[PDB]
Write a protein that binds this ligand. Sequence first.
Ligand SMILES: COCCOCCOCCOCCOCCOCCOCCO
Ligand SMILES: O=C(c1cc(O)c(O)c([N+](=O)[O-])c1)c1c(F)cccc1F
Ligand SMILES: O=C(c1cc(O)c(O)c([N+](=O)[O-])c1)c1c(F)cccc1F
Ligand SMILES: O=C(c1cc(O)c(O)c([N+](=O)[O-])c1)c1c(F)cccc1F
Ligand SMILES: O=C(c1cc(O)c(O)c([N+](=O)[O-])c1)c1c(F)cccc1F
Ligand SMILES: [Ca+2]
Ligand SMILES: [Ca+2]
Ligand SMILES: [Ca+2]
Ligand SMILES: [Ca+2]
Ligand SMILES: [Cl-]
Ligand SMILES: [Cl-]
Ligand SMILES: [Cl-]
Ligand SMILES: [Cl-]
Ligand SMILES: [Cl-]
Lengths: 121, 121, 120, 121
Amino acid sequence: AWKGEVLANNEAGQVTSIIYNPGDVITIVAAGWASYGPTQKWGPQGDREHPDQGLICHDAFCGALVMKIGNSGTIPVNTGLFRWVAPNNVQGAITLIYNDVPGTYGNNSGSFSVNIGKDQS
Amino acid sequence: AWKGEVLANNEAGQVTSIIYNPGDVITIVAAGWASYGPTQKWGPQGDREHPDQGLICHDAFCGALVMKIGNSGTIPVNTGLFRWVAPNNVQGAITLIYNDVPGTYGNNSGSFSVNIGKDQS
Amino acid sequence: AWKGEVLANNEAGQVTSIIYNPGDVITIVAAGWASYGPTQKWGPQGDREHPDQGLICHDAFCGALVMKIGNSGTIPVNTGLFRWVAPNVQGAITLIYNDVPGTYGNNSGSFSVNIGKDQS
Amino acid sequence: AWKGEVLANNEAGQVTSIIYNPGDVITIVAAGWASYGPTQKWGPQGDREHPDQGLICHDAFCGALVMKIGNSGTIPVNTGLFRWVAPNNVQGAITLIYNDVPGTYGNNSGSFSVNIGKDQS
Ligand SMILES: COCCOCCOCCOCCOCCOCCOCCO
Ligand SMILES: O=C(c1cc(O)c(O)c([N+](=O)[O-])c1)c1c(F)cccc1F
Ligand SMILES: O=C(c1cc(O)c(O)c([N+](=O)[O-])c1)c1c(F)cccc1F
Ligand SMILES: O=C(c1cc(O)c(O)c([N+](=O)[O-])c1)c1c(F)cccc1F
Ligand SMILES: O=C(c1cc(O)c(O)c([N+](=O)[O-])c1)c1c(F)cccc1F
Ligand SMILES: [Ca+2]
Ligand SMILES: [Ca+2]
Ligand SMILES: [Ca+2]
Ligand SMILES: [Ca+2]
Ligand SMILES: [Cl-]
Ligand SMILES: [Cl-]
Ligand SMILES: [Cl-]
Ligand SMILES: [Cl-]
Ligand SMILES: [Cl-]
């Protein structure tokens, strides 16, 4: 399992030591507070009212936690994933990233704490 | 394992199928949007800015997910618990509850979806 | 989890630390060689050729590994159980060598056993 | 997870659906009765009395269950493995094989039933 933090201001995100392989079942729990600019904070589901003006992940809100598996597209994580299997063929290291518009990360603050483990399969 | 929905307006909470037994390791993942009154909705960590005017759980924010194990006091859950073991001597049915001030649940809205499992031991 | 040895000559069995609770999923792996009397040795499934003349567990061969959960009837284990859920039963697991009561004194050897709770 | 049968007479082994990947923890349980020739049958540890006259796996008895992981050499399984991790540099599909002398599988009988699963990490 892996435990670590992902910074809201980082467009490159945080590479984990978890390698997702076909058939793997994983569990993620994410917590904390961040902002994509305003003087308020949101949890890892982000801000459900904010428009999408070019988010890296169009399937999660602005300020949400998302991931990639290897060189996949972005995949929503939000508060986490319970005994989850990837619905498409993806493989490789999990990278955690804060969902924001590229070029707009400089006014971001805060971080999410994340735990990830492989489950029985 | 258990999956279900906890209503923000349910002051009594939701008794799950899960009986926490001595030695149990559990994982909880909670998602969704709920409000303790405002138009805005929060995630399972609740609203970090709101004052505590008599929440049922003083160790979590207003609008957070919390629980009881048997007849315990409230225990924070938030976005969830990763491979977690309860305090000495706590045991019995898990009850999930929305953290609000007693008497003020009637204006609450939304729900959290929650999964609970037992981990290897 | 629990890891240990179960002695063929112990009629009373081996009380483990595992308290099986309703809904629990467990895995057991058992290995090794034991005898219920002959010079030969058998694995955890016991001796498929020996008749049952009053074994403590009628659902396993003579010389097999079996168990009880709390004060239950005997339940076959053999080489082990994969991600298994018990019938109906609650309490501590006791592992026992399947022999005819009164006939344990000529037994030899032991089985090595791992038990864990799985995800559920 | 994978559940299936390995025929004592199958010199090629039974290829499973399990791809062992670096860092995987697995559990195997094997049961049943097979023979390498005689009328008697043995369990998955095989026949402790039979000499080794050129077994595919010299670290297990004649008639034992063994495996390969990808193009590895043979690794004993016997009655099974409990939360086991492979040597480094071993990866790929698990193939289960009855331990006998090459060229002598044709007088074999019976089979083992085997379960394989990946464990938490
Ligand atoms: C962990 O330390 C906290 C210490 O709390 C002191 C103990 O308070 C016990 C009472 O909790 C009052 C909060 O009631 C909230 C309402 O729940 C309803 C559900 O109930 C189900 C259990 O039958
Ligand atoms: O969604 C955003 C948007 C998102 C941000 O995180 C952010 O920091 C800013 N910003 O401070 O200007 C704009 C946006 C955009 F990227 C282009 C046009 C209009 C916008 F609202
Ligand atoms: O924290 C609350 C408080 C909390 C609520 O969930 C709620 O629905 C209300 N309400 O709508 O009146 C007040 C509170 C209180 F309990 C007393 C005085 C002032 C408050 F804000
Ligand atoms: O199954 C057994 C049986 C089993 C034993 O392990 C053992 O040690 C003995 N014994 O030494 O008498 C008999 C048995 C029996 F109980 C009565 C008659 C014939 C038997 F083989
Ligand atoms: O161990 C074996 C051996 C093992 C077998 O399973 C088998 O079927 C036979 N066989 O029938 O030839 C020989 C062996 C050998 F390989 C050479 C000489 C003597 C042996 F028993
Ligand atoms: Ca921003
Ligand atoms: Ca309220
Ligand atoms: Ca005996
Ligand atoms: Ca043969
Ligand atoms: Cl980061
Ligand atoms: Cl939240
Ligand atoms: Cl805080
Ligand atoms: Cl696989
Ligand atoms: Cl055996």
